[PDB]
From a paper:
BMI1 is a 37 kDa protein composed of three distinct regions: a N-terminal RING domain2627, a central domain34 and a C-terminal proline-serine rich domain involved in the regulation of protein stability. The central domain of BMI1 was initially predicted as a putative helix-turn-helix (HTH) domain36 and more recently was defined as an ubiquitin-like (UBL) domain, also called RAWUL (RING finger- and WD40-associated ubiquitin-like) domain34. This domain is involved in protein–protein interactions and its best characterized binding partners are the polyhomeotic proteins (PHC1, PHC2, PHC3).
We obtained crystals of BMI1121–235 co-crystalized in the presence of the PHC233–56 fragment, which diffracted to 2.5 Å resolution. The structure confirmed that the central domain of BMI1 adopts an ubiquitin-like (UBL) fold. The unmodelled electron density was found in a wide opening between the β2 strand and α1 helix at the interface between the two BMI1 UBL symmetry related molecules. Superposition of the PHC2–BMI1 structure with the crystal structure of BMI1 UBL shows that the PHC2 fragment overlaps with the unmodelled electron density observed in the crystal. Since PHC2 binds at the interface of two symmetry related BMI1 UBL molecules, most likely in the crystal structure one molecule of PHC2 is bound to each monomer with 50% occupancy. This unusual binding stoichiometry observed in the crystal structure precludes modelling of the complex solely based on the X-ray data. Analysis of the crystal packing using PISA software suggests two possible homo-oligomerization interfaces. The second interface is centered around Ile212 and involves a cluster of tyrosine side chains (Tyr202, Tyr203, Tyr211 and Tyr213) that form a hydrogen bond network with backbone carbonyls.
Residue numbers in the entry:
A (entry chain A), B (entry chain A): 127 to 138, 161 to 231
Amino acid sequence: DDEIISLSIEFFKRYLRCPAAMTVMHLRKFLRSKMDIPNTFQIDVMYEEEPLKDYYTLMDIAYIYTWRRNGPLPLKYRVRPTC
Amino acid sequence: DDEIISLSIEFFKRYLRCPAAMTVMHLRKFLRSKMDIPNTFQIDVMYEEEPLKDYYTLMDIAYIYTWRRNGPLPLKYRVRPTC
Protein backbone atom coordinates (compact mmCIF):
# COMPACT_ATOMS: atom_id res chain seq x y z
CA ASP A 1 0.00 0.00 0.00
CA ASP A 2 0.99 3.60 -0.57
CA GLU A 3 -0.10 4.34 3.01
CA ILE A 4 1.70 5.73 6.03
CA ILE A 5 1.57 3.96 9.33
CA SER A 6 2.24 5.66 12.59
CA LEU A 7 3.96 3.59 15.27
CA SER A 8 6.13 3.42 18.36
CA ILE A 9 9.14 1.32 19.23
CA GLU A 10 10.60 0.80 22.71
CA PHE A 11 12.92 -1.65 24.43
CA PHE A 12 11.02 -4.57 26.03
CA LYS A 13 9.64 4.99 23.41
CA ARG A 14 10.34 6.73 20.08
CA TYR A 15 7.58 7.44 17.49
CA LEU A 16 7.61 6.80 13.79
CA ARG A 17 5.67 7.61 10.66
CA CYS A 18 6.62 5.03 8.07
CA PRO A 19 5.51 3.46 4.84
CA ALA A 20 3.15 0.61 5.65
CA ALA A 21 5.09 -1.56 3.10
CA MET A 22 8.17 -1.58 5.35
CA THR A 23 9.05 -4.91 7.00
CA VAL A 24 10.26 -6.23 10.33
CA MET A 25 13.58 -6.97 8.60
CA HIS A 26 13.86 -3.20 7.79
CA LEU A 27 13.03 -2.14 11.33
CA ARG A 28 15.51 -4.54 12.87
CA LYS A 29 18.12 -2.98 10.55
CA PHE A 30 17.06 0.47 11.51
CA LEU A 31 17.46 -0.45 15.19
CA ARG A 32 20.76 -2.18 14.53
CA SER A 33 22.06 1.05 13.03
CA LYS A 34 20.34 3.56 15.39
CA MET A 35 21.69 1.81 18.56
CA ASP A 36 24.93 0.56 16.98
CA ILE A 37 24.05 -3.07 17.82
CA PRO A 38 26.85 -5.54 16.94
CA ASN A 39 26.34 -8.90 15.10
CA THR A 40 27.28 -10.46 18.39
CA PHE A 41 23.50 -9.97 19.22
CA GLN A 42 20.06 -10.75 17.67
CA ILE A 43 17.08 -8.36 17.67
CA ASP A 44 13.56 -9.58 18.20
CA VAL A 45 10.88 -7.16 17.11
CA MET A 46 7.64 -7.89 18.92
CA TYR A 47 4.06 -6.71 19.05
CA GLU A 48 3.28 -7.75 22.58
CA GLU A 49 5.30 -10.64 23.93
CA GLU A 50 5.64 -12.41 20.63
CA PRO A 51 8.29 -11.88 18.05
CA LEU A 52 7.36 -11.22 14.49
CA LYS A 53 8.65 -12.87 11.36
CA ASP A 54 11.03 -10.81 9.27
CA TYR A 55 8.82 -10.77 6.10
CA TYR A 56 5.86 -9.18 7.94
CA THR A 57 4.92 -5.76 6.63
CA LEU A 58 3.56 -3.13 9.03
CA MET A 59 0.13 -3.63 7.42
CA ASP A 60 0.40 -7.36 8.00
CA ILE A 61 1.00 -6.54 11.64
CA ALA A 62 -1.96 -4.17 11.74
CA TYR A 63 -4.12 -6.87 10.03
CA ILE A 64 -2.83 -9.71 12.17
CA TYR A 65 -3.28 -7.92 15.48
CA THR A 66 -6.43 -6.15 14.41
CA TRP A 67 -5.09 -2.68 15.23
CA ARG A 68 -7.92 -0.15 14.97
CA ARG A 69 -5.81 3.01 14.24
CA ASN A 70 -6.31 4.05 17.87
CA GLY A 71 -2.91 5.56 18.55
CA PRO A 72 0.35 4.43 16.98
CA LEU A 73 1.05 0.73 16.46
CA PRO A 74 3.02 -0.21 19.58
CA LEU A 75 6.12 -2.24 18.82
CA LYS A 76 8.75 -3.48 21.19
CA TYR A 77 12.22 -4.89 20.78
CA ARG A 78 14.87 -6.82 22.54
CA VAL A 79 18.40 -8.17 22.08
CA ARG A 80 19.72 -11.69 22.74
CA PRO A 81 23.26 -13.05 22.29
CA THR A 82 23.48 -15.04 19.06
CA CYS A 83 24.99 -18.56 18.44
CA ASP B 1 43.01 -11.80 48.59
CA ASP B 2 45.55 -13.62 46.47
CA GLU B 3 42.89 -16.25 45.75
CA ILE B 4 41.31 -17.53 42.57
CA ILE B 5 37.58 -17.71 42.20
CA SER B 6 35.87 -19.94 39.74
CA LEU B 7 32.66 -18.62 38.20
CA SER B 8 30.19 -18.60 35.33
CA ILE B 9 28.58 -15.79 33.39
CA GLU B 10 25.54 -16.08 31.12
CA PHE B 11 22.97 -13.75 29.60
CA PHE B 12 19.87 -13.36 31.81
CA LYS B 13 27.17 -19.92 29.91
CA ARG B 14 30.95 -19.40 29.82
CA TYR B 15 33.26 -20.34 32.76
CA LEU B 16 35.98 -18.31 34.36
CA ARG B 17 38.85 -18.65 36.78
CA CYS B 18 39.66 -15.18 38.03
CA PRO B 19 41.39 -13.30 40.79
CA ALA B 20 38.94 -12.88 43.65
CA ALA B 21 40.04 -9.17 43.88
CA MET B 22 38.42 -8.41 40.50
CA THR B 23 35.30 -6.21 40.56
CA VAL B 24 31.91 -5.99 38.90
CA MET B 25 33.24 -2.91 37.08
CA HIS B 26 36.02 -5.14 35.57
CA LEU B 27 33.58 -7.84 34.51
CA ARG B 28 31.21 -5.39 32.89
CA LYS B 29 34.23 -4.11 30.92
CA PHE B 30 35.23 -7.58 30.01
CA LEU B 31 31.70 -8.24 28.71
CA ARG B 32 31.60 -4.90 26.94
CA SER B 33 34.74 -5.89 25.06
CA LYS B 34 34.01 -9.64 24.57
CA MET B 35 30.53 -8.97 23.01
CA ASP B 36 31.43 -5.61 21.43
CA ILE B 37 28.66 -3.83 23.37
CA PRO B 38 28.28 -0.14 22.41
CA ASN B 39 27.92 2.78 24.91
CA THR B 40 24.41 3.05 23.58
CA PHE B 41 23.66 0.27 26.21
CA GLN B 42 24.21 -0.42 29.96
CA ILE B 43 25.26 -3.78 31.43
CA ASP B 44 23.84 -5.06 34.67
CA VAL B 45 25.83 -7.82 36.28
CA MET B 46 23.64 -9.84 38.62
CA TYR B 47 23.87 -12.71 41.05
CA GLU B 48 20.29 -13.87 40.83
CA GLU B 49 17.76 -11.24 39.88
CA GLU B 50 19.55 -8.40 41.54
CA PRO B 51 22.22 -6.23 40.07
CA LEU B 52 25.47 -5.73 41.87
CA LYS B 53 27.27 -2.52 42.64
CA ASP B 54 30.35 -1.82 40.57
CA TYR B 55 32.80 -1.73 43.55
CA TYR B 56 31.89 -5.28 44.66
CA THR B 57 34.78 -7.72 44.49
CA LEU B 58 34.11 -11.37 43.64
CA MET B 59 34.87 -12.22 47.28
CA ASP B 60 32.36 -9.62 48.42
CA ILE B 61 29.84 -11.41 46.23
CA ALA B 62 30.79 -14.79 47.66
CA TYR B 63 30.54 -13.31 51.21
CA ILE B 64 27.31 -11.45 50.56
CA TYR B 65 25.51 -14.38 48.96
CA THR B 66 27.09 -16.94 51.22
CA TRP B 67 28.44 -19.05 48.35
CA ARG B 68 29.79 -22.33 49.74
CA ARG B 69 32.33 -23.14 46.93
CA ASN B 70 29.83 -25.69 45.58
CA GLY B 71 30.41 -25.20 41.87
CA PRO B 72 31.38 -21.93 40.22
CA LEU B 73 29.83 -18.65 41.37
CA PRO B 74 26.90 -18.20 38.99
CA LEU B 75 26.70 -14.71 37.54
CA LYS B 76 24.28 -13.36 35.01
CA TYR B 77 24.16 -10.26 32.87
CA ARG B 78 21.86 -8.15 30.84
CA VAL B 79 21.82 -5.04 28.64
CA ARG B 80 19.45 -2.05 28.78
CA PRO B 81 19.39 1.07 26.58
CA THR B 82 21.00 3.98 28.41
CA CYS B 83 19.72 7.61 28.86
